[PDB]
Structures are given as C-alpha cells and as structure tokens.
Amino acid sequence: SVLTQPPSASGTPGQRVTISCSGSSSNIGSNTVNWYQQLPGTAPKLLIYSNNQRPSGVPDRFSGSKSGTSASLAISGLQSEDEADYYCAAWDDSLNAWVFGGGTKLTVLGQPKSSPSVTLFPPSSEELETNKATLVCTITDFYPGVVTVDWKVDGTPVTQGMETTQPSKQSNNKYMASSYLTLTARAWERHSSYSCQVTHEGHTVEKSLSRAD
Amino acid sequence: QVTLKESGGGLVKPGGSLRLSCAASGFTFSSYSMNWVRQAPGKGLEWVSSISSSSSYIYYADSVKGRFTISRDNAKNSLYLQMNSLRAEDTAVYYCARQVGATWAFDIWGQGTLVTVSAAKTTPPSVYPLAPGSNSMVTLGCLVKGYFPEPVTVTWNSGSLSSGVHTFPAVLQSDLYTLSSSVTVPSSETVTCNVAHPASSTKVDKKIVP
Amino acid sequence: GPLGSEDDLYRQSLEIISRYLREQATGSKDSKPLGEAGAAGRRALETLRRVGDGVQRNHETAFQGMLRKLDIKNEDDVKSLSRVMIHVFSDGVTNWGRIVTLISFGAFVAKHLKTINQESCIEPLAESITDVLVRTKRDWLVKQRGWDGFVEFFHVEDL
C-alpha cells in the first residue's frame, strides 16, 4: 500500500485513540483524505470526507485532520461498537489512481494486553520424502489480535513462499494464528538457521531452530 | 432507497475471464462517477477502477492495467467490470462504489461479489506430524497439507483430548488449503490426531511421537 | 505554439460555451447535433443552463458593474476584455464556481451584444472565454474529469 497506517491501534472504553496515515506529496500533499470504517463481514462505510467532514450518521466522537503529507483519525472516547477496521484513502496525481492505506484494526480493550505464545516446528521426515519441507509456526494467546510475522533463513529475509493465516478469536477472547514456510527438500538441506519472528504491540517474539536435530 | 447491487461472482480458472455487473437504484446513475474496489480474504481494500458519468475518463490500478475493462450503460443503470487473464491474486470480494461529485468520497457501496480464481480439483490432505527437535509440558501437532476444498475436521484421541488444543484456520498455499492443529500435553502415554476430509471421503489417523 | 483546436478538450469546451452564449442571446435552443462532446456535452449543457441562470441572478450587480467599467459597444472592446478576464481568473485557487461565473458573465455580455446589434461578436467572445479557461486551467480541468466532472460537481437530485 502507498499509504502507510499502523496495523493496530487500541484503548480502554472512554480513551482517546489516534490512527495515523502517512503518504506523499502526490497524494495527501495535493488532495483531500477520506476515511472508511469496516465492520467484520460487511462493506466499508464512509466515515470522514474532505479531511475532517463527518457525513450524516457518523458520531461526533470521530474526527479527522490533515497536515502536509499525513492525515490522522481521532476517536474521542472509545466505545465497544468502534471495534472495526479503518482505512484512509487519497487520490494520487502521479499514479492517476486512488491509493488506500493498509488499514488499522482498532481494538476496544476488554482484557489486559497479552503477548503471543510462539512455537516453531521443523518439517517431518515423511514430508521430506515428497521432496518438500514445511516449517510451521503456531502463534497463540495474543491480544489485541494483530501480528506481523517475518521469517529468517540464515538471518536473511524471506519475502516469497511464506503464508500467514488471518488471526482467529480463541475461547478466552485472545487470538491465535499460524505461519508457513514451504521449501524444497534441496533448499532445506542447504540452509542451517530458521526463525519465525512475531511482532505484537512494537515488541518482537522470536523462535528459531537448526536443521541438525 | 439508494442501493448498489453486484453480480457475476464465482469460481473461474486462472487465465480465464469473468464479467461483473452492478445494478444501481434510487438515484440518477448518469450523474455520478463509479468505482470498483476489491478486498482479498483477510486483506485491505484495493481500488481497481473508475469511470466518469459519461464514460469520458477511465482509470485503472497498475495491478489490473491491460487485463480489466470498466464500462457503464446509463440507459440500464448498470456498471460493468470485464476481467480477463485472471490470476489467484485477483481472488477478492469486488465492491461497486458511488463517488460524490463535490468531494470524491465513496458514499454508497454494494454488498460485494466474491470472485475465486481456482483451477484446483478435489484433493485429499496429507497428514504430517508436528513435533519438537533438539521435562514439563510438550506441544505436539498435525499438519493437514494440500487439501481441496474446505473444510477439514481434526480431533485428538478421537475426542478424549480437547483441553490445550488449538486448531488453526486454513490458509491457501498454491491453489490448495493447509491447516494445522496443536495439542499441549504433559511430558512422558499415546497421542494421535484424527483428520477427516468429507469432500474426498478421507479418514486418516496419525500417531505423534518425538 | 500549437493551434488550440489541436486539443480535444479545447474543441469540446469551445462547442459547449458557444452553444451556451448563443442560446442565451437568441433565446432559442440549437437542435442540430454536437460535433465534439456528444452525450457528455449534452449533459454539460443541461447543467450549465440550470446553474448558469442562477449565477447570472446572484452576480447581476457585479456583472452589470463590470460591463460598465469595460463599456462594451464594438468589436475592439472584446480585445481588451480578454486581458482583464485572464488576470482576474488566473489569480488564486480555481474552482467550478469561478469557472461557471466566467461562463455566466459571457452569457450576460452576449445578451448585451444582441440588444446593440453586434451578434457577429458572440462567436469571438465564446472563443475568448474558452481561451481564458482552457489556456490557463487545462491541467486542473483534466484532473477534475473535464465536462464529466462539471456535471458531477453540480448534481443535486429531485424533489
């Protein structure tokens, strides 16, 4: 996404929470910003238009602002029904296209924050017999339910061949997720260090393994 | 009542073509710019295309240029998206959205239409054990790899184990679904996952032993 | 540089403005088809008639006054009108209101020409307004979706 937003924002009921949207001179610097609110399983709804205008049907606790190449959405006094995804959007003069931010999940904290529980599994020998090798990284008990997972192979970044699940609400109202790194048996055999890195609320939880085990 | 309603969504093969339609009601369709915006499973909104009131100005996102064609029939209150050379990255819910003339905000949206770009046939999963490498409490599991379609059911000791288990949601790995299930048991006398794929009538059992 | 008529937006704007100034002075609508724009120019004309007649009323005092400061009576008075229009219109922020005010003033100036038997000067006046608009605001007009955007901007809906 051309517009950068934090994947997670949060507060306790009644708190004031801000969601930043960072862009560039061709988009936010030359055009107005709009904000959309998306409730899970539903279509986006217009929240803010022309940087700071609320349409009819939007509570006055939602406010917007724009300054240079940045925009901010403020929620003054968080309520439970405010728990949703928030997207900023601006027209880009260089692209001749609309650019949307990556979205921010706003969590209304109804429990203390909890760090993820990370577990890394090597490929099985049965799988290695098919000439494929899947590393599985289970992530449990995290709250708010937003994670960033990055895989490292011998301390180098992995940008392809990884798949991360969407977070899923657990019985205790915390979240779980899973991440996969699929390689050939040949690729597994030529690297020695493997790590699943989970960023949750700015803080990174790490789990690594070595091929000979 | 001002409404937009999308249609034409469904399953199509990679390299294939699909035409989407959006029926507009309760407003002067010919006096607004219209847009297509999409959202891939669990991903963010991506703008696709727009068309001005009299079709004089059309724009596309770089991700779809040369493959997608936006058009409108003002006499019919209908907006269209002709999608060709479809890829798995094109799998998304596709929303039709009306643009406000004075502000350019997207005030009215449809319910969306799901488009799935998939050439996958019915495939049974392969069950692989998940166990630690190189005590107290131990986390074991089962890797349910490469099945189609959803769902798959997983149990532990045919139902006995339920406490400490986590069945993770499925994710796509090149046209097929992969899922995993973990169970936390105390260290040191039998652990086995029971996987079933009704769509391929598959019943597999895997004993997990490090 | 290049002829204005080489530019499709210039030709389309010239046709909409000329049709507008003419029917405002003559009192009779043109039935023959639009060569340029087509259905887009046809929509733009509908909007310009609705919005234009209102802007002429709300700007009457300012229009009649500006007409006096320029004291139009012949062809050469249209030559000095352009350089006034260029400086005032280029000043500051562009918006559809300022553009629809410029077109409204020309319809007012064309009505004045119809009474003083100078109807031949309507066509060069329409060219002058188009010159002012497209030659100073082309990029803004293109970004705003031209005449499609003008119709979208001023749309209201009954009843």
Residues belonging to chain A: 213
SS3 B159: helix
Q: Give the chain A residue nearest B94 (alpha carbons).
A: A43
Cβ proximity of B210 and B139 under 8 Å: no
B130 CB within 8 Å of a chain A CB: yes
Of A146, A166, A113, nearest in space to A19 by CA: A146
Q: Report the C-alpha gap between C27 and A35 in whole angstroms.
A: 47
Most A CBs within 10 Å, among B168, B172, B179, to test the A interface? B168
SS3 A132: strand
Residue A158 CB burial class (10 angstroms; 0-12, 13-18, ≥19): middle
User: What residue ranges do the domains of chain A occupy?
Assistant: 1-110, 111-211
Q: Tell me the structure's resolution in angstroms, rounded to a single decimal.
A: 2.2
Q: Cβ–Cβ of C154/B54 closer than 8 Å?
A: no
Q: Report the C-alpha gap between A71 and A53 in whole angstroms.
A: 13
Q: Report the C-alpha gap between B209 and A178 in whole angstroms.
A: 22
Residue position matching structure tokens 């289970």: A138
Residue B42 CB burial class (10 angstroms; 0-12, 13-18, ≥19): exposed
SS3 B40: coil
User: What residue ranges do the domains of chain B occupy?
Assistant: 1-119, 120-208
C8 CB within 8 Å of a chain B CB: no
CB-nearest partner of C146 from B30, B33, B56: B56
Q: Report the C-alpha gap between C127 and B196 in whole angstroms.
A: 77
Instruction: For the beta carbon of residue B88, count every other beta carbon within 10 angstroms.
Output: 14
Q: Which helix (H) or strand (E) holds B126?
A: strand B126-130
Q: Cβ–Cβ of B101/C43 closer than 8 Å?
A: no
Residues belonging to chain B: 210
Q: Report the C-alpha gap between A211 and A189 in whole angstroms.
A: 8
Which tokens hold the place of C110? 């064309």
Cβ proximity of B119 and B13 under 8 Å: yes
Q: Is the dihedral of CA A25, A27, A32, A38 positive or negative?
A: negative
Per-residue H/E/C for A60-124: CCEEEEEECCEEEEEEECCCHHHCEEEEEEEEECCCCEEEEECCEEEEECCCCCECCEEEEECCC
Pairing of strands A104-108, A8-11: parallel
Residue position matching structure tokens 């184990």: B161
Which tokens hold the place of B61? 């996102």
Distances from the Cα of A160 to the Cαs of A163, A183, A184, A194, B69, in angstroms? 9, 10, 13, 15, 30
How would CATH label the architecture of B120-208?
Answer: Sandwich (2.60)
Q: Report the C-alpha gap between A166 and C1 in whole angstroms.
A: 58
How would CATH label the architecture of C1-154?
Answer: Orthogonal Bundle (1.10)
Residue position matching structure tokens 């030659």: C135
C4 CB within 8 Å of a chain B CB: no
Residue B149: cis peptide before it, omega within 30 degrees of 0: yes
Q: Report the C-alpha gap between B82 and C120 in whole angstroms.
A: 50
Contacts of B61 in chain A (CB under 8 A): 97-98
Rounded to 5, what percent of chain B is helix, strand, coil?
Answer: 5, 55, 40
Residue C36 CB burial class (10 angstroms; 0-12, 13-18, ≥19): middle
Q: Report the C-alpha gap between C128 and A115 in whole angstroms.
A: 69
